[PDB]
Amino acid sequence: SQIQFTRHASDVLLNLNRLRSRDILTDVVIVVSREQFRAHKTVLMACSGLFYSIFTDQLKRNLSVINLDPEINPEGFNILLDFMYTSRLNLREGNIMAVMATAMYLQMEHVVDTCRKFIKASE
Amino acid sequence: SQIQFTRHASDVLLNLNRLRSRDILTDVVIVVSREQFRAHKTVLMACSGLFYSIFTDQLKRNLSVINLDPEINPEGFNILLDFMYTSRLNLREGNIMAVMATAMYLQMEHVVDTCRKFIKASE
Ligand SMILES: O=C(Cn1ccc2c(=O)[nH]c(NCCc3ccccc3)nc21)Nc1ccncc1Cl
Ligand SMILES: O=C(Cn1ccc2c(=O)[nH]c(NCCc3ccccc3)nc21)Nc1ccncc1Cl
Numbered sequence: 026s027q028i029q030f031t032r033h034a035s036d037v038l039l040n041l042n043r044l045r046s047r048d049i050l051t052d053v054v055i056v057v058s059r060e061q062f063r064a065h066k067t068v069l070m071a072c073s074g075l076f077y078s079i080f081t082d083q084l085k086r087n088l089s090v091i092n093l094d095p096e097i098n099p100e101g102f103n104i105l106l107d108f109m110y111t112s113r114l115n116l117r118e119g120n121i122m123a124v125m126a127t128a129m130y131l132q133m134e135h136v137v138d139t140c141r142k143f144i145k146a147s148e
Numbered sequence: 149s150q151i152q153f154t155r156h157a158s159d160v161l162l163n164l165n166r167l168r169s170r171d172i173l174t175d176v177v178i179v180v181s182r183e184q185f186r187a188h189k190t191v192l193m194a195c196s197g198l199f200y201s202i203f204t205d206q207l208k209r210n211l212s213v214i215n216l217d218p219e220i221n222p223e224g225f226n227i228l229l230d231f232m233y234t235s236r237l238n239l240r241e242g243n244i245m246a247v248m249a250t251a252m253y254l255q256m257e258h259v260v261d262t263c264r265k266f267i268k269a270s271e
Contacts, residue, residue: 026238026240027236027237027238028236028237028238028239028262028266029235029236030231030235030236030237030258030262031235033161033195033231033235034157034158034160034161034235035157036194037157037160037161037191037194037195037232038156038157038160038161040193040194040195041190041194044190044193044194049193049203049204049209050175050189050190050193050203050209052173065190066173067164067167067173067188067190068160070163070167070172070173071159071160071163071164071167072156072160072163080172080173081172086172086173108153108156109160112152112153112154112156112157113150113151113152113153114150114151114153115149115150115151116151117149135153139151139153143151
């Protein structure tokens with residue numbers, strides 16, 4: 026009865042990334058050391074147990090700024106934020122440990138497991 | 149270099165639909181005759197030329213209520229809103245003309261073309 030549009034979810038995500046790139050309807054700034062990253066809380070909640078847990082709570086739902094642990098790796102966060110908006114995870118030898126540790130902190134279980142498989146499949 | 153997560157966009161969209169179902173971070177009511185439908189403007193902009201054109205404009209970006217033409221078919225709209233959040237288009241003989249006319253009004257070109265192919269593939 027239904028008609029499956031196989032590229033619709035990917036097209037939506039690309040358009041959501043275009044809106045982020047233009048600061049259209051962005052509602053939060055994530056501060057990570059000296060970095061600031063704007064985003065849509067909806068996308069953060071959709072991709073991260075940590076963000077889901079923060080914004081589902083009525084007490085913190087309307088926060089416009091989130092300060093992460095100053096010890097959180099800014100390149101690791103940037104890689105994971107790009108992943109959330111693209112479905113593409115840039116894992117490399119130079120960044121794997123930073124990305125895996127950041128994904129554990131953001132409670133991105135499927136990404137952590139993928140980093141594990143990565144470590145296992147690499148030297 | 150990148151690692152493609154083939155189900156990430158679909159998982160994001162499902163989670164965005166869960167947020168809609170719970171009225172979490174919904175920011176607009178679409179009024180269609182005697183019906184009210186809550187949604188995320190980001191998702192409306194991602195799926196519809198009409199909503200994109202309305203909310204990209206700074207003048208209308210912060211509108212919390214949109215009244216559609218009272219002549220817009222509420223079942224047609226409901227079908228298309230469900231499609232936006234699911235990638236699944238419930239086309240049937242009893243609704244095809246209402247959905248196609250509503251998709252033209254919402255400027256959902258790929259959905260209109262799919263309705264055309266539907267008409268062509270049916271008696
Ligand atoms: O699933 C996610 C985000 N998301 C992505 C990856 C991932 C993860 O690895 N762990 C968790 N743990 C929190 C799970 C939880 C707790 C309480 C109730 C329901 C779900 N969450 C993760 N978001 C979501 C869930 C349900 N409705 C709406 C949304 Cl936006
Ligand atoms: O593409 C869409 C929505 N969307 C879905 C289907 C569909 C359609 O069939 N026609 C149009 N016409 C408006 C096209 C336009 C006009 C001016 C500038 C760019 C694009 N839009 C459609 N949204 C979008 C585009 C670019 N950045 C961000 C977003 Cl959210």
